[PDB]
Amino acid sequence: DNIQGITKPAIRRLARRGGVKRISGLIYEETRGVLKVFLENVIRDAVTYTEHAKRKTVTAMDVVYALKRQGRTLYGFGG
Amino acid sequence: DNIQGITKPAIRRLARRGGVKRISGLIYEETRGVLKVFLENVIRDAVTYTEHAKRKTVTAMDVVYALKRQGRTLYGFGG
Amino acid sequence: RYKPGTVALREIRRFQKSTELLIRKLPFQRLVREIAQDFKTDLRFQSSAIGALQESVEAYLVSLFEDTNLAAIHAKRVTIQKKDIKLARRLRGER
Amino acid sequence: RYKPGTVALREIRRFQKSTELLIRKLPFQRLVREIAQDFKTDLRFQSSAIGALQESVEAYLVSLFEDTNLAAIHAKRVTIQKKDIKLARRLRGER
Amino acid sequence: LAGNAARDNKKTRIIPRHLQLAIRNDDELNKLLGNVTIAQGGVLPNIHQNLLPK
Amino acid sequence: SQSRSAKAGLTFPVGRVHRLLRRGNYAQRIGSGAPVYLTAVLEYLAAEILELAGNAARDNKKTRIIPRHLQLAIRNDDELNKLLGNVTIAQGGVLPNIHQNLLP
Amino acid sequence: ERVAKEEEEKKLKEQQWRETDLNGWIKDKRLKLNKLIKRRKEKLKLRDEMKDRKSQVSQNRMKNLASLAEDNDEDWLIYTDITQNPEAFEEALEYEYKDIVELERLLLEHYDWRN
Amino acid sequence: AKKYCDVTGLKGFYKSPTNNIRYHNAEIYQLIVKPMAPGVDQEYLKLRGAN
Amino acid sequence: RKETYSSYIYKVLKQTHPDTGISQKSMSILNSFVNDIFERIATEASKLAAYNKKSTISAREIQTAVRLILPGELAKHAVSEGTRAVTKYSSST
DNA sequence: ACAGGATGTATATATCTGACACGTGCCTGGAGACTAGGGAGTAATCCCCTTGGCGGTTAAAACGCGGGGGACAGCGCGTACGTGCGTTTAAGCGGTGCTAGAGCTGTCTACGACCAATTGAGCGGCCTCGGCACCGGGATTCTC
DNA sequence: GAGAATCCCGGTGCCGAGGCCGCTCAATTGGTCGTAGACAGCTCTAGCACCGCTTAAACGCACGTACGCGCTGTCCCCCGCGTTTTAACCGCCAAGGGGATTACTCCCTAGTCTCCAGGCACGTGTCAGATATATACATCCTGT
């Protein structure tokens, strides 16, 4: 039950940070699919990075290069 | 007549190459505007590139590396 | 009492007005492990890596909600639909 | 007599497989000359750079145009407008 | 891919249009080279169905 | 004797960025004006960001610098947003924006 | 047709007033043109003052924006009125220029290089 | 030595703090010194050898 | 000896806002921002050095790269301040 | 509708912990003096390519005008989702033990820069020719 | 069933595509050696598991209305085509601007040794906030 382990009122909270008034009932599972393919495309690069690092622990450096390379660089956690 | 070098059959052809069927009768000016801003970005970068090279003509090599800076890289005219 | 639409503006102001995380941590950690063990089994993860994944999907989702709401106003509507999401994903560039 | 729309898709097909240059050399060459006037004076060019400019511009206009066509049909319409163009510019992210 | 895009287009010479369809028809090379643009090859033909009348 | 940062009137280090340029394999030869030019550019950029961040922190009537103030300073400014239109922020939030027709 | 008839009646009354008292109508039209020019100058001054990031108007805009980002229908209208109007200001300036042109036409009906 | 305005050649009262160009009065500054392209002040300063 | 820019931006914050403090997450924001700007400008200067058959990076390449990276008002102010700093450093006599 | 007993407020104190600050010891990279090789500055000079401009053509752009398929405002069924309330679940904490492996250090050594000799791979240039560009007659297949 | 309008097929002119040759400067072969990397060894930060507990939130469900979506009339604004105007294309000779290349002096920066202090790891204090006590009045909510 882990694909919809993140829940629908949390999706509403993220949507109402995003400024949309009314949301459908059929947008939850497609946002879950978008989220799933987004983390797939991120931790594929992150697990290649930690595979080449001769490490079993995924650190903050591998994930931060993984979103740096896709044009979505993130500040603060790169220290 | 300065900007009027490009004309109605030209952008009709370009919109037809966009696969559109019905155009509006005064979509003219904003297309002229985005035309203007795309060229002035590209040849501003080309002018800086040829200024640093002490080359007071603009070459093809400069503008294809200006596009490759801009993320719209061209193939065939050097690189 | 309130008319339907004023308290929605109040909570949308409250959600835009704050900076807290909106995704539960343990289902996300479980999701990260279950989506990572197919690539490589018995992996270990860093807590700040999970926080980085948290803030990345939060920024991606809220930006996605901006341009899908822009698709909603573009079609003279208020509620978003699935074709608004597909239009935003296509016009963003990815498939 | 004739009906509009079918000859429109007819020379859609006629210009679809042929991949020729569209906009003439001379007026766009003059426009490139006057748009480079204000940055540096007495600038010359060469014929390959002008062709590179033509290719980049036609690529940009096509890549904007079927995207704004998709934005037009998503609002259940065929004719394109101002706000379709602004929505395409906002969703592609030049703003 | 340039060769098999050249055989079906009745030409024994490879033209940039043919390899344009070769890189627009295979998905792996399509998003391998999605940000690039090529020389006088145009666009692969497609027609969306509500533009098709009747 | 004395450092090159006070010789050029700067607070950012010069030998540090000279070192970081040296074995960063950008090129095998590096001139002398390169670290002082980079140092002055970094000076101006950090000073501008700190000016706007301090104005936002004072605007919150709160005596520290919190990344919400950094987000406010980044997105309120025009060309700082243009320079930083790609980077995602840590613990920053989203600027308040409601589209006009949603107001009744 | 009622609005067109009212506009024609207003035009006939304006023509009768211009034929009856051209001096007073010309003075009133000149005063209206001067008021329109003063409003256009104030709008251009506001547009120039908004362009300065170090101006006090930009600081007040940042104070109102953070006031909507740190801590009702009227506050909702204030948030609607604090939006960026780059093209709306240009359209309002074009409308004011058209109004000034109409005022000059009404004055007619009834920047020095040496410095 | 006498100080002269770099643009007009008249008497130079003020000097700009960004590009070290001496100008005559306000309208010269607002129309020339502020919006000038970057790379034009150098051959303005080259005539008196100040680049 | 883990190396970071904390002290320097502490003082240049202190010459304009004396009664203000920095959070550690914010501290990391300015550190990562400085490193990102350094990386972008330096790789553009190296690319422009490799442009012209030139094996040396000097101040002119970095001035051109600053004019390429930054938007216009930031660019003109950055080259003004950098030119003033270079002329201060060169005339050390 | 009023009285009576609950909290609420105020305006001082008091004690006490929490999340920031500041101050100090001590190492390794910055500064200075120095040589010397070499990349860069600079003048000359060959000659490639770009710029101007006859003028003649002619396909392409401009104007205009009938008209019809589409934008767009208005309308209305209904259904899908807002709004609010009761029940349920495992989200968050925090406590801590176990230990995996991230990180650091010393030692060995095998890989790769570096200099030199040298030869043919591979680039500039020249030349024959055939596939596609062009071109025209006619089959043929959408369209109204 | 007319009417263009693409597709097909045969013929022809043509120009870059491929093949060949001179020869240079770069690939390869070969030995030296400082040293980065492998690699074993070792300290201990931190990641994993998990027992149980408050409860916010997730889940579920009922009610209903703004709103998605189909229908529709109407203004009108682009579409299609004919004519006319205009400048794009093309041949093309020509002046010379301005890189390409070459020659060569020289300032400029890598390299090395000595070195010391600026800057980081890790200590010690300071108000901000929380929490109380106490004596009244004040006020509020409820029952009588």
Tab-separated table of N, CA, C and O in Angstrom, chain G residues 28-42 96 100 103:
chain	number	residue	atom	x	y	z
G	28	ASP	N	-12.970	76.329	-20.478
G	28	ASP	CA	-13.257	75.087	-19.763
G	28	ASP	C	-12.537	73.898	-20.391
G	28	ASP	O	-12.028	73.026	-19.675
G	29	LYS	N	-12.467	73.853	-21.727
G	29	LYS	CA	-11.736	72.785	-22.400
G	29	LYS	C	-10.233	72.894	-22.170
G	29	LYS	O	-9.555	71.870	-22.047
G	30	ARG	N	-9.702	74.119	-22.096
G	30	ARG	CA	-8.292	74.308	-21.773
G	30	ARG	C	-7.992	73.890	-20.338
G	30	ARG	O	-6.936	73.306	-20.068
G	31	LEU	N	-8.910	74.177	-19.410
G	31	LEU	CA	-8.746	73.724	-18.030
G	31	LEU	C	-8.804	72.203	-17.932
G	31	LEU	O	-8.035	71.596	-17.174
G	32	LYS	N	-9.701	71.573	-18.698
G	32	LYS	CA	-9.781	70.114	-18.718
G	32	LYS	C	-8.530	69.495	-19.333
G	32	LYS	O	-8.045	68.462	-18.854
G	33	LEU	N	-7.992	70.117	-20.387
G	33	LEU	CA	-6.752	69.638	-20.993
G	33	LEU	C	-5.572	69.806	-20.045
G	33	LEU	O	-4.688	68.944	-19.994
G	34	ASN	N	-5.546	70.905	-19.283
G	34	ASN	CA	-4.492	71.111	-18.295
G	34	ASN	C	-4.582	70.097	-17.161
G	34	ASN	O	-3.556	69.597	-16.687
G	35	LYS	N	-5.804	69.778	-16.720
G	35	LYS	CA	-5.991	68.752	-15.697
G	35	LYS	C	-5.585	67.373	-16.208
G	35	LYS	O	-4.972	66.589	-15.471
G	36	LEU	N	-5.909	67.067	-17.469
G	36	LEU	CA	-5.499	65.799	-18.069
G	36	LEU	C	-3.984	65.717	-18.217
G	36	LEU	O	-3.392	64.654	-17.997
G	37	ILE	N	-3.343	66.834	-18.569
G	37	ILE	CA	-1.890	66.866	-18.699
G	37	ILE	C	-1.222	66.712	-17.338
G	37	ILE	O	-0.190	66.041	-17.214
G	38	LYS	N	-1.798	67.325	-16.298
G	38	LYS	CA	-1.270	67.168	-14.945
G	38	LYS	C	-1.428	65.736	-14.447
G	38	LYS	O	-0.525	65.201	-13.791
G	39	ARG	N	-2.562	65.100	-14.762
G	39	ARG	CA	-2.763	63.698	-14.404
G	39	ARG	C	-1.789	62.786	-15.145
G	39	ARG	O	-1.261	61.832	-14.560
G	40	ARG	N	-1.531	63.076	-16.425
G	40	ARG	CA	-0.566	62.294	-17.194
G	40	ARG	C	0.851	62.476	-16.664
G	40	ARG	O	1.628	61.515	-16.616
G	41	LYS	N	1.201	63.700	-16.257
G	41	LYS	CA	2.517	63.955	-15.676
G	41	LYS	C	2.680	63.251	-14.336
G	41	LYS	O	3.752	62.707	-14.044
G	42	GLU	N	1.625	63.240	-13.516
G	42	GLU	CA	1.670	62.519	-12.246
G	42	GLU	C	1.780	61.012	-12.464
G	42	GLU	O	2.508	60.327	-11.733
G	96	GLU	N	-5.246	57.896	-21.544
G	96	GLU	CA	-5.074	59.280	-21.114
G	96	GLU	C	-4.586	60.168	-22.251
G	96	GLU	O	-4.970	61.339	-22.326
G	100	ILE	N	-6.518	63.353	-23.661
G	100	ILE	CA	-5.860	64.644	-23.843
G	100	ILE	C	-6.016	65.130	-25.279
G	100	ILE	O	-6.153	66.333	-25.527
G	103	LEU	N	-9.479	66.450	-25.472
G	103	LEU	CA	-9.530	67.755	-24.816
G	103	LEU	C	-8.918	68.844	-25.691
G	103	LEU	O	-9.430	69.970	-25.738
